[PDB]
Amino acid sequence: KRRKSV
Amino acid sequence: KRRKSV
Amino acid sequence: AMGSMERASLIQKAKLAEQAERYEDMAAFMKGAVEKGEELSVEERNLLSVAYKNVVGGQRAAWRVLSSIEQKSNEEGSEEKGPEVREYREKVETELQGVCDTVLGLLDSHLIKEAGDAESRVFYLKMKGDYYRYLAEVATGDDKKRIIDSARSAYQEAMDISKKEMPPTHPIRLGLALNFSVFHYEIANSPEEAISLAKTTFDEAMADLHTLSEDSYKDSTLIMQLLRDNLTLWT
Amino acid sequence: AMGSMERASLIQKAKLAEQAERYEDMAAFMKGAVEKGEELSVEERNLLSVAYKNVVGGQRAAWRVLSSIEQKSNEEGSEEKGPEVREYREKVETELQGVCDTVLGLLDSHLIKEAGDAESRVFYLKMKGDYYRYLAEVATGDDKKRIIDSARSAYQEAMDISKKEMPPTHPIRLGLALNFSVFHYEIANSPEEAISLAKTTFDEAMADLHTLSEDSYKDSTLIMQLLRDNLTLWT
Ligand SMILES: COC[C@H]1CC[C@@H]2/C1=C\[C@]1(C)C(=C(C(C)C)C[C@@H]1O)[C@@H](O)[C@H](O)[C@@H]2C
Ligand SMILES: COC[C@H]1CC[C@@H]2/C1=C\[C@]1(C)C(=C(C(C)C)C[C@@H]1O)[C@@H](O)[C@H](O)[C@@H]2C
Ligand SMILES: [Mg+2]
Ligand SMILES: [Mg+2]
Ligand SMILES: [Mg+2]
Ligand SMILES: [Mg+2]
Ligand SMILES: [Mg+2]
Ligand SMILES: [Mg+2]
């Protein structure tokens, strides 16, 4: 899906 | 769950 | 405010805001469209109601969270944490009342008075019952009974027209009955009336399904399932 | 603005707004707390970052919806629908820039300058990289390269401190590497650097897990899984 960021 | 309204 | 934007542009931007899940913007675009003074089409009344139902649904859900915190804070043995919970529940409450008052104002100036067709008049009176009911959900003072009766009166006039002018399967008629039944169950302390109304509405619609096309059937059966969900919960 | 409310009340209301999923309110309460001029604790910096990450995450998601509509409207064979899509994408874009500028302003006045400990300094510089990166996501003009380089410079100074002063498993160090890697992959057109950074960060953290308690282990492995999710997507 969509790349992860935090 | 919670009663329905619309 | 939205005074300088073309009605059709407001409508187009409301649809874009819906796609973007930007319901506050959606509601402000639709408020601007209503304030252009022309009657709304079916599609446009739907956008108007979806925008506000989402805005107020978010404020109601937050109010319930804060109300439940505030109630626990008032239970025996609860540490005193000062006025903050009550203040911030009041702040959310005030903003929600303001949204209800905005919608009620749009209905009174001048959507209801120019709505001649059953499908427009019942829709707007259902909205009038819904937004007085949201005011009733938070009302705790001198005016509570009159707010409740305002919701009742609006739902009742919508029911009387819808029974006269709309088939029992019409989605507006079914959604109105659904909400008026919820009004009875949780606002008016009349769970028997709420159950009776949901049951009668469901059964009268069942008996009319045979007149419908496949697409109308799916529209009506969708809201009938909500009636059944409530009957299941309440019985 | 929040000037008359006690710092501790703002903090308490930010926590209530979080519980109520009222992130705009949460962000405004935390902005008021920062403007009291005292340094923020770990807990409070977390509230500050969660409030804005949610507000801007909502505006970014809406901007992407509108941007994709606007791009389809510009494709060959697309009916001309007038300026509305571009206008309303600009409106959402302007509001998002304003939120980034607000956070960048809080960092520059005066959170970063008073942040002496690695855990505070790296946190705030990671936020500085994140909000310049959100500005870069929408930047299309003269300043785009400088906005990109601002994000880069902030992430880089955070990386240099975090490598010196924090263990490889520290969640702030891992989240910073995660986002700087996303910056490389999708802002700076450096997918190889993004992959290398995610890989090296993941492996250095793996090798330090053995020093950790069970609770620290779960905190670090949570963000390591995000690094792995990206490596999986990108390779
Ligand atoms: C004022 O009360 C409006 C409310 C009464 C029933 C339903 C209404 C809202 C919207 C616009 C619709 C749906 C259906 C998907 C269920 C949910 C939407 O919110 C329409 O499509 C229905 O035809 C119908 C007008
Ligand atoms: C500025 O970058 C802050 C960002 C870097 C990594 C992570 C941060 C955000 C918050 C506050 C946390 C989590 C974890 C649940 C993953 C998601 C939250 O948004 C904290 O609990 C972590 O200790 C840690 C500080
Ligand atoms: Mg005109
Ligand atoms: Mg008329
Ligand atoms: Mg009829
Ligand atoms: Mg004080
Ligand atoms: Mg200091
Ligand atoms: Mg250290």
Coordinates of C-alpha atoms and ligand atoms in Angstrom, one line a residue:
Chain A
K1 CA 0.0 0.0 0.0
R2 CA 1.4 3.3 1.0
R3 CA 5.0 3.6 2.4
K4 CA 5.3 4.1 6.1
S5 CA 6.3 7.2 8.0
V6 CA 6.0 8.0 11.7
Chain B
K1 CA -23.4 -1.7 18.9
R2 CA -24.8 1.7 18.5
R3 CA -28.4 2.2 17.2
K4 CA -28.7 3.3 13.6
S5 CA -29.8 6.6 12.2
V6 CA -29.4 8.0 8.7
Chain C
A1 CA -18.7 34.6 2.7
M2 CA -19.2 32.2 -0.1
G3 CA -21.0 35.2 -1.5
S4 CA -18.6 35.8 -4.4
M5 CA -18.5 32.2 -5.6
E6 CA -20.9 31.0 -8.4
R7 CA -23.6 28.6 -7.1
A8 CA -22.5 25.9 -9.6
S9 CA -18.8 26.3 -8.4
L10 CA -19.9 25.9 -4.8
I11 CA -21.8 22.7 -5.8
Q12 CA -18.8 21.4 -7.7
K13 CA -16.5 22.2 -4.7
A14 CA -18.9 20.5 -2.3
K15 CA -18.6 17.3 -4.4
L16 CA -14.8 17.6 -4.4
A17 CA -14.7 18.2 -0.6
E18 CA -16.9 15.1 -0.2
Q19 CA -14.4 13.0 -2.2
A20 CA -11.6 14.5 -0.1
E21 CA -13.5 13.8 3.1
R22 CA -13.3 17.5 3.9
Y23 CA -16.8 17.7 5.4
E24 CA -16.4 21.1 7.1
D25 CA -15.5 22.6 3.7
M26 CA -18.3 20.6 2.1
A27 CA -20.8 22.1 4.6
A28 CA -19.5 25.6 4.1
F29 CA -19.8 25.2 0.3
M30 CA -23.3 23.9 0.6
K31 CA -24.3 26.6 3.1
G32 CA -23.0 29.1 0.4
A33 CA -25.1 27.4 -2.3
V34 CA -28.3 27.5 -0.1
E35 CA -27.6 31.2 0.6
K36 CA -27.8 31.9 -3.2
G37 CA -31.6 31.7 -2.5
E38 CA -32.6 29.2 -5.2
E39 CA -34.2 25.9 -4.3
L40 CA -32.0 22.9 -4.2
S41 CA -32.3 19.9 -6.4
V42 CA -32.5 16.3 -5.0
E43 CA -28.7 15.8 -5.6
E44 CA -27.9 19.2 -3.9
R45 CA -30.2 18.5 -0.9
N46 CA -28.3 15.2 -0.5
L47 CA -25.0 17.0 -0.5
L48 CA -26.3 19.6 2.0
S49 CA -27.4 16.8 4.4
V50 CA -24.4 14.6 4.0
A51 CA -22.0 17.6 4.7
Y52 CA -23.7 18.6 8.0
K53 CA -24.5 15.0 9.1
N54 CA -20.7 14.4 8.9
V55 CA -19.7 17.6 10.6
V56 CA -22.2 17.2 13.5
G57 CA -21.6 13.4 13.6
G58 CA -17.9 14.1 14.4
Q59 CA -18.8 16.8 17.1
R60 CA -21.4 14.4 18.6
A61 CA -19.0 11.5 18.8
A62 CA -16.4 13.8 20.5
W63 CA -19.1 15.2 22.9
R64 CA -20.0 11.7 23.9
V65 CA -16.3 10.8 24.6
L66 CA -15.9 14.0 26.8
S67 CA -19.3 13.6 28.5
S68 CA -18.4 10.1 29.5
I69 CA -15.1 11.3 30.9
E70 CA -16.8 14.1 32.8
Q71 CA -19.4 11.6 34.3
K72 CA -16.6 9.3 35.5
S73 CA -14.9 12.4 37.0
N74 CA -18.0 13.1 39.0
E75 CA -18.4 9.5 40.5
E76 CA -17.6 8.9 44.2
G77 CA -13.8 8.4 44.8
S78 CA -12.8 10.2 41.6
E79 CA -9.9 12.6 42.1
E80 CA -10.8 16.3 41.6
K81 CA -9.0 17.3 38.3
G82 CA -10.4 20.8 38.1
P83 CA -12.7 22.4 35.6
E84 CA -10.9 21.3 32.4
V85 CA -13.1 18.4 31.4
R86 CA -16.3 20.3 31.9
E87 CA -14.8 23.3 30.1
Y88 CA -13.7 21.4 27.1
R89 CA -17.0 19.4 26.9
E90 CA -18.7 22.8 27.0
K91 CA -16.5 24.1 24.3
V92 CA -17.3 21.1 22.0
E93 CA -21.0 21.4 23.0
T94 CA -21.1 25.0 22.1
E95 CA -19.6 24.4 18.7
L96 CA -22.0 21.5 18.0
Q97 CA -25.0 23.8 19.0
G98 CA -23.6 26.3 16.7
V99 CA -23.6 23.9 13.8
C100 CA -27.2 22.8 14.6
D101 CA -28.3 26.4 14.8
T102 CA -26.6 27.1 11.4
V103 CA -28.5 24.2 9.7
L104 CA -31.7 25.1 11.4
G105 CA -31.3 28.6 10.2
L106 CA -30.8 27.5 6.6
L107 CA -33.9 25.4 6.9
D108 CA -35.9 28.3 8.3
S109 CA -34.3 30.9 5.9
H110 CA -35.7 29.8 3.5
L111 CA -35.5 26.1 2.5
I112 CA -38.6 24.9 4.2
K113 CA -40.9 27.7 3.2
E114 CA -40.1 27.2 -0.5
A115 CA -40.2 23.4 -0.5
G116 CA -43.5 22.4 -2.2
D117 CA -42.9 18.9 -3.3
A118 CA -43.2 16.0 -0.8
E119 CA -39.7 14.8 -1.5
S120 CA -38.2 18.2 -0.6
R121 CA -40.5 19.2 2.2
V122 CA -40.2 15.8 4.0
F123 CA -36.4 15.9 3.5
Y124 CA -36.0 19.3 5.1
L125 CA -38.4 18.6 7.9
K126 CA -36.6 15.4 8.7
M127 CA -33.3 17.6 8.8
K128 CA -35.2 20.0 11.1
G129 CA -36.1 17.1 13.5
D130 CA -32.6 15.7 13.3
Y131 CA -30.8 18.9 14.2
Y132 CA -33.3 19.7 17.1
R133 CA -32.7 16.1 18.2
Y134 CA -28.9 16.8 18.3
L135 CA -29.6 19.9 20.3
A136 CA -31.8 17.7 22.6
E137 CA -28.9 15.2 23.1
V138 CA -27.0 17.9 24.9
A139 CA -29.8 20.0 26.4
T140 CA -29.8 19.9 30.2
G141 CA -31.7 23.1 31.1
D142 CA -35.0 25.2 31.0
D143 CA -35.4 24.8 27.3
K144 CA -34.9 21.0 27.0
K145 CA -38.6 20.2 26.8
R146 CA -39.2 22.8 24.1
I147 CA -36.1 21.6 22.1
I148 CA -37.5 18.1 22.3
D149 CA -40.9 19.2 21.3
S150 CA -39.4 21.1 18.3
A151 CA -37.8 17.9 17.1
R152 CA -41.0 16.0 17.7
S153 CA -43.1 18.6 15.8
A154 CA -40.8 18.6 12.8
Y155 CA -40.6 14.8 12.6
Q156 CA -44.3 14.6 13.0
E157 CA -45.2 17.1 10.2
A158 CA -42.6 15.2 8.0
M159 CA -44.3 11.8 8.9
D160 CA -47.8 13.2 8.1
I161 CA -46.7 14.4 4.6
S162 CA -44.7 11.4 3.9
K163 CA -47.6 9.0 4.8
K164 CA -49.9 11.0 2.5
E165 CA -47.5 11.7 -0.5
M166 CA -44.8 9.0 -0.6
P167 CA -44.8 5.3 -1.0
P168 CA -43.9 3.3 2.1
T169 CA -40.6 2.2 0.5
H170 CA -39.4 5.7 -0.3
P171 CA -35.9 6.0 1.2
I172 CA -36.7 9.4 2.7
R173 CA -39.8 8.0 4.3
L174 CA -37.8 5.1 5.7
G175 CA -34.9 7.3 7.0
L176 CA -37.3 9.7 8.6
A177 CA -39.1 6.8 10.4
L178 CA -35.8 5.4 11.4
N179 CA -34.7 8.7 13.0
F180 CA -38.0 9.5 14.5
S181 CA -38.0 6.0 16.1
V182 CA -34.5 6.8 17.5
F183 CA -35.9 10.1 18.8
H184 CA -38.7 8.2 20.6
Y185 CA -36.3 5.6 22.0
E186 CA -33.6 7.8 23.3
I187 CA -34.8 11.4 23.5
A188 CA -38.5 11.1 24.4
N189 CA -38.2 8.1 26.8
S190 CA -40.8 6.2 24.6
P191 CA -39.1 2.9 23.6
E192 CA -42.5 1.3 22.9
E193 CA -43.4 4.0 20.4
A194 CA -39.9 3.7 18.9
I195 CA -40.3 -0.1 18.5
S196 CA -43.8 0.2 17.1
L197 CA -42.8 2.8 14.6
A198 CA -39.7 0.8 13.4
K199 CA -41.8 -2.4 13.1
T200 CA -44.8 -0.8 11.3
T201 CA -42.4 1.1 9.0
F202 CA -40.4 -2.1 8.2
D203 CA -43.6 -4.2 7.5
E204 CA -45.4 -1.6 5.4
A205 CA -42.2 -1.2 3.3
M206 CA -41.8 -5.1 3.0
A207 CA -45.3 -5.2 1.5
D208 CA -44.5 -2.5 -1.2
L209 CA -41.1 -4.0 -2.3
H210 CA -42.9 -5.8 -5.1
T211 CA -43.7 -2.6 -7.0
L212 CA -40.0 -1.6 -7.2
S213 CA -37.2 -2.0 -9.8
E214 CA -34.1 -3.8 -8.8
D215 CA -32.3 -0.5 -8.1
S216 CA -35.2 1.0 -6.0
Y217 CA -35.4 -2.4 -4.2
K218 CA -31.7 -2.1 -3.1
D219 CA -32.2 1.5 -2.0
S220 CA -35.2 0.7 0.1
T221 CA -33.9 -2.6 1.6
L222 CA -30.7 -0.8 2.7
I223 CA -32.6 1.5 5.1
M224 CA -35.0 -1.3 6.0
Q225 CA -32.0 -3.2 7.3
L226 CA -31.2 -0.2 9.6
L227 CA -34.8 -0.4 11.0
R228 CA -34.2 -4.1 11.6
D229 CA -30.8 -3.5 13.3
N230 CA -32.5 -1.2 15.8
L231 CA -35.4 -3.6 16.4
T232 CA -32.8 -6.3 17.0
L233 CA -30.9 -4.1 19.4
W234 CA -34.1 -3.0 21.3
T235 CA -35.9 -6.2 21.6
Chain D
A1 CA -5.1 33.1 22.0
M2 CA -4.6 30.2 24.4
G3 CA -2.7 33.0 26.3
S4 CA -5.2 33.1 29.2
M5 CA -5.3 29.3 29.9
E6 CA -2.8 27.7 32.4
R7 CA -0.1 25.5 30.8
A8 CA -1.2 22.5 32.7
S9 CA -4.9 23.0 31.6
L10 CA -3.8 23.2 28.0
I11 CA -1.8 20.0 28.4
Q12 CA -4.8 18.3 30.1
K13 CA -7.2 19.6 27.3
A14 CA -4.7 18.3 24.6
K15 CA -5.0 14.8 26.2
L16 CA -8.8 15.1 26.2
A17 CA -8.9 16.3 22.6
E18 CA -6.7 13.3 21.6
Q19 CA -9.2 10.9 23.3
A20 CA -12.0 12.7 21.5
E21 CA -10.0 12.5 18.2
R22 CA -10.3 16.3 18.0
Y23 CA -6.8 16.8 16.6
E24 CA -7.2 20.5 15.4
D25 CA -8.2 21.3 19.0
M26 CA -5.3 19.1 20.3
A27 CA -2.8 21.1 18.1
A28 CA -4.1 24.4 19.2
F29 CA -3.9 23.4 22.9
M30 CA -0.3 22.2 22.4
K31 CA 0.6 25.3 20.4
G32 CA -0.7 27.3 23.4
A33 CA 1.4 25.2 25.7
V34 CA 4.6 25.7 23.7
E35 CA 3.9 29.4 23.6
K36 CA 4.1 29.5 27.4
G37 CA 7.9 29.5 26.7
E38 CA 8.9 26.6 29.0
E39 CA 10.6 23.5 27.5
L40 CA 8.3 20.5 26.9
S41 CA 8.7 17.2 28.6
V42 CA 8.9 13.9 26.6
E43 CA 5.2 13.3 27.1
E44 CA 4.3 16.8 26.0
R45 CA 6.6 16.7 22.9
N46 CA 4.8 13.6 22.0
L47 CA 1.4 15.3 22.3
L48 CA 2.7 18.2 20.2
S49 CA 3.9 15.9 17.4
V50 CA 0.8 13.6 17.5
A51 CA -1.6 16.7 17.2
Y52 CA 0.1 18.2 14.2
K53 CA 0.9 14.9 12.5
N54 CA -2.8 14.2 12.5
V55 CA -3.9 17.6 11.4
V56 CA -1.4 17.7 8.5
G57 CA -2.0 14.0 7.7
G58 CA -5.7 14.8 7.1
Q59 CA -4.8 17.9 4.9
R60 CA -2.1 15.8 3.0
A61 CA -4.5 13.0 2.3
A62 CA -7.1 15.5 1.0
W63 CA -4.5 17.3 -1.1
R64 CA -3.6 14.0 -2.7
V65 CA -7.2 13.2 -3.5
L66 CA -7.6 16.7 -5.1
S67 CA -4.2 16.6 -6.9
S68 CA -5.1 13.3 -8.5
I69 CA -8.5 14.8 -9.7
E70 CA -6.7 17.9 -11.0
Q71 CA -4.2 15.7 -12.9
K72 CA -6.9 13.6 -14.5
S73 CA -8.7 16.9 -15.5
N74 CA -5.5 17.9 -17.3
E75 CA -5.2 14.6 -19.4
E76 CA -5.9 14.6 -23.1
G77 CA -9.7 14.2 -23.8
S78 CA -10.7 15.5 -20.4
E79 CA -13.7 17.9 -20.5
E80 CA -12.8 21.4 -19.3
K81 CA -14.6 21.8 -16.0
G82 CA -13.2 25.3 -15.2
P83 CA -11.0 26.5 -12.4
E84 CA -12.7 24.8 -9.5
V85 CA -10.5 21.7 -8.9
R86 CA -7.3 23.8 -9.1
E87 CA -8.9 26.5 -6.9
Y88 CA -10.0 24.0 -4.2
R89 CA -6.7 22.1 -4.4
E90 CA -4.9 25.5 -3.9
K91 CA -7.2 26.3 -0.9
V92 CA -6.3 22.9 0.8
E93 CA -2.7 23.4 -0.2
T94 CA -2.6 26.9 1.4
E95 CA -4.1 25.6 4.6
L96 CA -1.7 22.8 4.7
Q97 CA 1.3 25.2 4.2
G98 CA -0.1 27.3 6.9
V99 CA 0.0 24.4 9.3
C100 CA 3.5 23.5 8.3
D101 CA 4.6 27.1 8.8
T102 CA 2.9 27.2 12.2
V103 CA 4.8 24.1 13.4
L104 CA 8.1 25.3 11.9
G105 CA 7.5 28.5 13.7
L106 CA 7.1 26.8 17.0
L107 CA 10.3 24.9 16.4
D108 CA 12.2 28.0 15.5
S109 CA 10.6 30.1 18.3
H110 CA 12.0 28.6 20.5
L111 CA 11.8 24.9 20.9
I112 CA 15.0 23.9 18.9
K113 CA 17.2 26.6 20.4
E114 CA 16.4 25.5 24.0
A115 CA 16.6 21.7 23.3
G116 CA 19.9 20.5 24.8
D117 CA 19.3 16.8 25.4
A118 CA 19.7 14.5 22.4
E119 CA 16.1 13.1 22.9
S120 CA 14.6 16.6 22.6
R121 CA 16.9 18.0 20.0
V122 CA 16.6 15.0 17.6
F123 CA 12.8 14.9 18.1
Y124 CA 12.4 18.6 17.2
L125 CA 14.8 18.4 14.3
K126 CA 13.0 15.3 13.0
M127 CA 9.7 17.4 13.2
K128 CA 11.6 20.3 11.3
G129 CA 12.6 17.8 8.5
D130 CA 9.0 16.3 8.5
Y131 CA 7.2 19.7 8.1
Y132 CA 9.7 20.9 5.4
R133 CA 9.1 17.6 3.7
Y134 CA 5.3 18.2 3.7
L135 CA 6.0 21.6 2.2
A136 CA 8.2 19.9 -0.4
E137 CA 5.4 17.4 -1.3
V138 CA 3.3 20.4 -2.6
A139 CA 6.1 22.7 -3.8
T140 CA 6.2 23.3 -7.5
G141 CA 8.1 26.6 -7.9
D142 CA 11.3 28.7 -7.4
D143 CA 11.7 27.7 -3.8
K144 CA 11.3 23.9 -4.2
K145 CA 15.0 23.1 -4.1
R146 CA 15.5 25.3 -1.0
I147 CA 12.5 23.7 0.8
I148 CA 13.9 20.2 -0.1
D149 CA 17.3 21.2 1.2
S150 CA 15.8 22.6 4.4
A151 CA 14.2 19.2 5.0
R152 CA 17.4 17.5 4.2
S153 CA 19.5 19.7 6.5
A154 CA 17.2 19.3 9.5
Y155 CA 17.0 15.4 9.0
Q156 CA 20.8 15.4 8.6
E157 CA 21.6 17.3 11.8
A158 CA 19.0 15.1 13.7
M159 CA 20.8 11.9 12.2
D160 CA 24.2 13.2 13.2
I161 CA 23.2 13.8 16.8
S162 CA 21.1 10.6 17.1
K163 CA 24.1 8.5 15.8
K164 CA 26.4 10.1 18.4
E165 CA 24.0 10.3 21.4
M166 CA 21.3 7.6 21.0
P167 CA 21.3 3.8 20.8
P168 CA 20.5 2.3 17.5
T169 CA 17.2 1.0 18.9
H170 CA 15.9 4.3 20.2
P171 CA 12.4 4.8 18.8
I172 CA 13.2 8.5 17.9
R173 CA 16.3 7.4 16.1
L174 CA 14.4 4.7 14.2
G175 CA 11.5 7.0 13.3
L176 CA 13.8 9.7 12.1
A177 CA 15.6 7.2 9.9
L178 CA 12.3 5.9 8.6
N179 CA 11.2 9.4 7.6
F180 CA 14.5 10.5 6.2
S181 CA 14.5 7.4 4.1
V182 CA 11.0 8.3 2.8
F183 CA 12.4 11.8 2.1
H184 CA 15.2 10.2 0.0
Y185 CA 12.8 7.9 -1.8
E186 CA 10.1 10.3 -2.7
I187 CA 11.3 13.8 -2.3
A188 CA 15.0 13.7 -3.2
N189 CA 14.7 11.1 -6.1
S190 CA 17.3 8.9 -4.3
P191 CA 15.6 5.6 -3.9
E192 CA 19.1 3.9 -3.4
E193 CA 19.9 6.1 -0.5
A194 CA 16.4 5.5 0.9
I195 CA 16.9 1.7 0.7
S196 CA 20.4 1.8 2.1
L197 CA 19.3 3.9 5.0
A198 CA 16.3 1.8 5.9
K199 CA 18.5 -1.4 5.7
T200 CA 21.4 -0.1 7.7
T201 CA 19.0 1.3 10.3
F202 CA 17.1 -1.9 10.6
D203 CA 20.3 -4.1 10.9
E204 CA 22.0 -1.8 13.4
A205 CA 18.8 -1.9 15.5
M206 CA 18.5 -5.7 15.2
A207 CA 22.0 -6.1 16.7
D208 CA 21.2 -3.9 19.7
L209 CA 17.8 -5.5 20.6
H210 CA 19.6 -7.8 23.1
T211 CA 20.3 -4.9 25.5
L212 CA 16.7 -4.1 25.8
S213 CA 13.9 -4.9 28.3
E214 CA 10.7 -6.5 27.0
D215 CA 8.9 -3.2 26.8
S216 CA 11.8 -1.4 25.0
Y217 CA 12.0 -4.3 22.7
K218 CA 8.4 -4.0 21.7
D219 CA 8.8 -0.2 21.2
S220 CA 11.8 -0.6 18.9
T221 CA 10.6 -3.6 17.0
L222 CA 7.3 -1.7 16.2
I223 CA 9.2 1.0 14.2
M224 CA 11.7 -1.6 12.8
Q225 CA 8.7 -3.3 11.2
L226 CA 7.9 0.0 9.5
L227 CA 11.4 0.1 8.1
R228 CA 10.9 -3.5 6.8
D229 CA 7.5 -2.6 5.3
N230 CA 9.2 0.1 3.2
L231 CA 12.1 -2.1 2.2
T232 CA 9.4 -4.7 1.1
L233 CA 7.5 -2.2 -0.9
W234 CA 10.7 -0.7 -2.5
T235 CA 12.6 -3.9 -3.3
Ligands
LIG1 C1 -32.5 14.3 5.5 O1 -32.4 12.8 5.5 C2 -31.6 12.4 4.4 C3 -31.5 10.9 4.6 C4 -32.9 10.2 4.6 C5 -32.6 8.8 3.9 C6 -31.5 9.0 2.9 C7 -30.8 10.3 3.4 C8 -29.4 10.7 3.2 C9 -28.5 10.3 2.1 C10 -28.2 11.5 1.2 C11 -28.9 9.0 1.3 C12 -28.3 7.9 1.9 C13 -28.5 6.5 1.4 C14 -27.1 6.0 0.9 C15 -28.9 5.7 2.6 C16 -27.5 8.2 3.1 C17 -27.2 9.7 2.8 O2 -26.7 10.4 4.0 C18 -29.8 9.1 0.1 O3 -29.1 8.5 -1.0 C19 -31.1 8.5 0.4 O4 -31.8 8.5 -0.9 C20 -32.0 9.3 1.5 C21 -32.3 10.8 1.0
LIG2 C1 9.0 13.7 15.9 O1 8.9 12.2 15.7 C2 8.1 11.6 16.7 C3 8.0 10.1 16.3 C4 9.4 9.5 16.2 C5 9.1 8.0 16.6 C6 8.0 8.0 17.6 C7 7.3 9.4 17.4 C8 5.9 9.7 17.5 C9 5.0 9.1 18.6 C10 4.7 10.2 19.7 C11 5.4 7.7 19.2 C12 4.9 6.7 18.4 C13 5.0 5.2 18.6 C14 3.6 4.7 19.1 C15 5.5 4.6 17.3 C16 4.0 7.2 17.3 C17 3.7 8.7 17.8 O2 3.2 9.5 16.8 C18 6.3 7.6 20.4 O3 5.6 6.8 21.3 C19 7.7 7.1 20.0 O4 8.4 6.9 21.2 C20 8.5 8.1 19.1 C21 8.7 9.5 19.7
MG3 MG -24.3 33.4 -10.8
MG4 MG -40.9 25.5 -4.4
MG5 MG -45.9 10.7 -4.4
MG6 MG 0.5 29.7 35.1
MG7 MG 17.2 23.2 27.6
MG8 MG 22.4 8.6 25.1

